[PDB]
Design a protein around this nucleic acid. Sequence first.
RNA 1: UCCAAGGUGAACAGCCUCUGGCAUGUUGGAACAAUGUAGGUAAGGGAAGUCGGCAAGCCGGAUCCGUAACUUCGGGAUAA
RNA 2: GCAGCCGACUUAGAACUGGUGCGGACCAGGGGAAUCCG
RNA 3: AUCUAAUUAGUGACGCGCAUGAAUGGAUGAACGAGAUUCCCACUGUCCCUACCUACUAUCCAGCGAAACCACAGCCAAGG
RNA 4: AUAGCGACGUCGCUUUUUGAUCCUUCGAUGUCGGCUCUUCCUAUCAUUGUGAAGCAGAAUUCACCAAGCGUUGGAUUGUUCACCCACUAAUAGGGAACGUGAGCUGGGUUUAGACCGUCGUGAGACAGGUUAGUUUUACCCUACUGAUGAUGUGUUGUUGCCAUGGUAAUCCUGCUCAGUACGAGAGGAACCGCAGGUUCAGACAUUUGGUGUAUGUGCUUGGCUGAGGAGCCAAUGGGGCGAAGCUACCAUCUGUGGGAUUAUGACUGAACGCCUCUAAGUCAGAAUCCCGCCCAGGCGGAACGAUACGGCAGCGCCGA
RNA 5: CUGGGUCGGGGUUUCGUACGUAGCAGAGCAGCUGCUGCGAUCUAUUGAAAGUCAGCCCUCGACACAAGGGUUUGU
Lengths: 63, 394, 131
Amino acid sequence: MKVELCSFSGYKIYPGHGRRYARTDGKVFQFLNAKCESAFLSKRNPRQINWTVLYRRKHKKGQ
Amino acid sequence: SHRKFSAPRHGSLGFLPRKRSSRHRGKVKSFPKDDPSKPVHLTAFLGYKAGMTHIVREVDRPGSKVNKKEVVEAVTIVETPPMVVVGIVGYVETPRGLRTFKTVFAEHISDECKRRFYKNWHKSKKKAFTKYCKKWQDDAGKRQLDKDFSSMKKYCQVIRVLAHTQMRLLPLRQKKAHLMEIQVNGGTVAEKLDWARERLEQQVPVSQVFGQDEMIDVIGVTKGKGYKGVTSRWHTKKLPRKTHRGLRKVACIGAWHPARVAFSVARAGQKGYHHRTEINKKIYKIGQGYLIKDGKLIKNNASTDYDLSDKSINPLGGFVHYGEVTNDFVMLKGCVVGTKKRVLTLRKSLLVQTKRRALEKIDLKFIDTTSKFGHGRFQTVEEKKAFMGPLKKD
Amino acid sequence: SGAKFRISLGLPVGAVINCADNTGAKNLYIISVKGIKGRLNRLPAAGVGDMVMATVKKGKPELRKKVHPAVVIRQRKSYRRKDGVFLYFEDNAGVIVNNKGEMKGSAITGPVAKECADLWPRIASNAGSIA
RNA sequence: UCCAAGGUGAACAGCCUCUGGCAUGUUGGAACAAUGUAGGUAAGGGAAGUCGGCAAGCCGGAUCCGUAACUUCGGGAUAA
RNA sequence: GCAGCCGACUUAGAACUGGUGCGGACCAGGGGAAUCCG
RNA sequence: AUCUAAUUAGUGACGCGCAUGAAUGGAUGAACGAGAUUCCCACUGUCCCUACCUACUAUCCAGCGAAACCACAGCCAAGG
RNA sequence: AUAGCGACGUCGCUUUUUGAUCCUUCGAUGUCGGCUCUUCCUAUCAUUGUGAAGCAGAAUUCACCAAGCGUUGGAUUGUUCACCCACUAAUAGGGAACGUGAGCUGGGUUUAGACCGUCGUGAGACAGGUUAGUUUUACCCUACUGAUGAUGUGUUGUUGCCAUGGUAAUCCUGCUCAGUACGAGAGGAACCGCAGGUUCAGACAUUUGGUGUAUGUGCUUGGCUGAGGAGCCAAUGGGGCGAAGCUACCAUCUGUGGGAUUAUGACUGAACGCCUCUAAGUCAGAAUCCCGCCCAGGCGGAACGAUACGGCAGCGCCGA
RNA sequence: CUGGGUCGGGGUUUCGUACGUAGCAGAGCAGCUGCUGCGAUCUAUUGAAAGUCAGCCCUCGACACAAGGGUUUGU
Ligand SMILES: [Mg+2]
Ligand SMILES: [Mg+2]
Ligand SMILES: [Mg+2]
Ligand SMILES: [Mg+2]
Ligand SMILES: [Mg+2]
Ligand SMILES: [Mg+2]
Ligand SMILES: [Mg+2]
Ligand SMILES: [Mg+2]
Ligand SMILES: [Mg+2]
Ligand SMILES: [Mg+2]
Ligand SMILES: [Mg+2]
Ligand SMILES: [Mg+2]
Ligand SMILES: [Mg+2]
Ligand SMILES: [Mg+2]
Ligand SMILES: [Mg+2]
Ligand SMILES: [Mg+2]
Ligand SMILES: [Mg+2]
Ligand SMILES: [Mg+2]
Ligand SMILES: [Mg+2]
Ligand SMILES: [Mg+2]
Ligand SMILES: [Mg+2]
Ligand SMILES: [Mg+2]
Ligand SMILES: [Mg+2]
Ligand SMILES: [Mg+2]
Ligand SMILES: [Mg+2]
Ligand SMILES: [Mg+2]
Ligand SMILES: [Mg+2]
Ligand SMILES: [Mg+2]
Ligand SMILES: [Mg+2]
Ligand SMILES: [Mg+2]
Ligand SMILES: [Mg+2]
Ligand SMILES: [Mg+2]
Ligand SMILES: [Mg+2]
Ligand SMILES: [Mg+2]
Ligand SMILES: [Mg+2]
Ligand SMILES: [Mg+2]
Ligand SMILES: [Mg+2]
Ligand SMILES: [Mg+2]
């Protein structure tokens, strides 16, 4: 297996789940589920979505 | 006039009486052919459907791309607590068929097995087999049934062990255990019978009935769908939108002069809850149930030699609509018939198989245990807590 | 040595797709799918890596009003790899080849699916990116 | 045929409310099968369906730009 | 030409701000090229 | 000839016109048309190829309750 | 002359063409096509097994057993027919009241409104063209699909047998064989393996996708409860995301073995001293047939369990 | 001394960070001589709040309930 990270949410992707996406200019992206996929397609910036690992890291929450 | 354009007919007439099954437990219509050369062994088992999940496994088949690659496959979990052998029944061939000759029952029968003999256990006085059981502790009964054993050995050609499941260990509402006759295939009738006579009132685990990476058959009852129209019962073509008296129908029933509706014409009616036997399902893993080993319990029955975790086969929050499985289970490739917590009959293969798919060895490297009650995200609670960190609830 | 696995097919007859080469054609009107027998009322459909017949509805004048073999290299319908990943691209696109297999053009713009690549070796040589 | 409130809004449009009125339009209860009648939503394709884009769907208000052929010189025109 | 006191809805411009959402419900023209006839 | 991959369709020409033709009006033509046709863009469950959801039915029950139709009636094959 | 054809003749079969007739129906059998769906025929296009070529291979002809299984997607036309484009293995032909309108549609024929051409003095006519033109009823009987139940075994229950019915799988590609056999060359096979796919069938929901009134959780328009908070109304207010459940070649899983034999090729072997597959006897033999696997389970049976109080009582077996 | 049922508690999961309070965070504006008010929004408490079987999983926490009722059947 190659356990790997979601492009938008930043969670952990397991072999059976998720969805792959290939843009016309390369840049293969990976999504945990339709939630993250729809956010990315609607071009939501992960920095302002609260439940995202990027948002938590940027706001220094946890640790 | 002929049809302008041909098309294969919808549905199959091989399953023609599309009626609700008269039975709820799958019936073994044909047991594997007997041969005295092989040693004695059972030929069938009873399990319960729990759910489905992934497996990641390495593929070994020269020629294809998946060779030396790893793929994910859907598997179905069947909980199979060990059966209890509570009788033996003999059969003799006659020119009119295969007639039953004599049944002999064990001295001790569990009340969970005696539930099957009553339509209302609550109001009953539970008097079943009370007078029959007295035949074992007196010399009159002992010499009554020993010559019966001798007569069965002399005149019987088929021996089937009457064994019942053990629903006390299942997380189900039902306490009335199922029971069935599992034919004994092995040597001659004498040893075939004096091998069951000590298996009487004893345990039979599935690990000694089936083996790994073996092709078996599953007999069960489909999920019921009730009264369904023709377009969903037979998957006929849907009529155009301009149709006046409905469009989910079949336009022409039949010609004129046959003067009757033929049995081959699709009609509305009952869909689902049919009896079905699907062959060639491959065992992937015969799991081991929970067991207490020196105080603590061993739970890692879903831990492979490539994963080395401590996760059980149960997903997070247990199997949806079934519960959690704690007994030895059987993992089958692909989907199987029936609904959740439905009883299934496992049957040994009727055919001799010499094929790459049949003889392929199986070596799993990952069993998915994420939650099925939604989009699961974490394999186990420990890793979920490690990723999340402390919460407000503590 | 290994034939392609079945993948979902989301390009029936009548679909116009991008032409990702330098032949000058900008459209590809799927006309029929090679190797399809079909049944009653069932439209022939093509997926990644399948040879089709196509016409150019927009492009260089000499490429129009004619029937060209073509190969589909990208599709937007999600298809499942045997390893268990569902993959789908941004657009439906193909290239123009002849019956033997080599491309009429010389270069391909954008990624090329692995199923197309390992099945048509000549296209994989010109493919800038893979999967 | 006469009388005609408040808000939104161009509006006596549609929607909500006050004064006044009414008890769901000649019956109720329990289920939520098929087939209907009336509404919706659908991956990828986009008329390949059909005699025929029938039906449904797209557009839609207002402000600022821009607006062709043709013309009976007025229009076309809310062109696009 | 100024000072004071009252005032009715408009129009334009700017900053800030929201997960690009803003005629958010309701109301509310699909478009173009041609032929026949009137 | 053009339109399409493919056109008994459409448009533009050709005219020997079975049987066109000048107030039994000929030709054209802006604007208009719940008029008749063809093509293109956009859009879509028309279709590939179906699925799911909602409301009222249908369903069962309490009460209440007709009508069309009816020689006698109602399982088939062949024969005459 | 007879691989393949076949003149001049001559004998037949079929009722999927048209005729001929007028037997039934005029107190009405709804009159073209298309859509949908089932079954049947073989005069076999492909596939299985064969025999013959002017069959070297490849390709292609002719013939036999044979209808098990397939026989497509579109432009033009109301079409049936026809033609073309493309794929395919093949795009064979037909019947069932020219199958099928209380199944649809109504484009065409075939009412009443109109227009034109020809004909007529005229009203009007035209298997000439054009445009618009209400498609009713099942709750009865049967058939069919499913659902209770009845029938005997003393009453009930559990486990079972199978008489009978139904029946299902199909075709292709790639690799290897092999650039080999064959052939001067160009070209160019086959079996056995291996990997897949088409059509069909039976399931199923881990995963992907669809639905979504858990009316679950945010957002938001107009109004309303004095305001905040909390909410509500707009026949589901609208719009994101969405559990469960249903559900898609739009996801995933599975799809089988024998027997007697047909065509044909043979063995031994007479009739007919030799010869002969046939006369007696024997062999191989297939998408055919039958059965198995699979679905249902008979006014059809089997084995086994328990068999009606403690105030009454009902029962079972025995007392030749 | 066992059983289910209701409620509660955990598990899972959906959405996305609640009310209140605090902030020298806030385009700015008004009043009082730096202070006080209006102010969409932002930050912290806050992966918070809410829902979660009705056909999800476990409980051994609380509560009451459960030795019933009716009609039949004989070799
Ligand atoms: Mg046919
Ligand atoms: Mg209608
Ligand atoms: Mg789930
Ligand atoms: Mg069709
Ligand atoms: Mg009402
Ligand atoms: Mg009322
Ligand atoms: Mg009234
Ligand atoms: Mg009414
Ligand atoms: Mg769609
Ligand atoms: Mg879409
Ligand atoms: Mg068509
Ligand atoms: Mg319309
Ligand atoms: Mg215009
Ligand atoms: Mg003209
Ligand atoms: Mg007019
Ligand atoms: Mg057309
Ligand atoms: Mg013309
Ligand atoms: Mg004249
Ligand atoms: Mg004149
Ligand atoms: Mg005239
Ligand atoms: Mg009633
Ligand atoms: Mg009739
Ligand atoms: Mg009649
Ligand atoms: Mg024949
Ligand atoms: Mg009829
Ligand atoms: Mg008409
Ligand atoms: Mg008329
Ligand atoms: Mg009724
Ligand atoms: Mg049979
Ligand atoms: Mg799902
Ligand atoms: Mg979803
Ligand atoms: Mg879902
Ligand atoms: Mg508020
Ligand atoms: Mg109203
Ligand atoms: Mg959604
Ligand atoms: Mg044989
Ligand atoms: Mg012979
Ligand atoms: Mg033989």
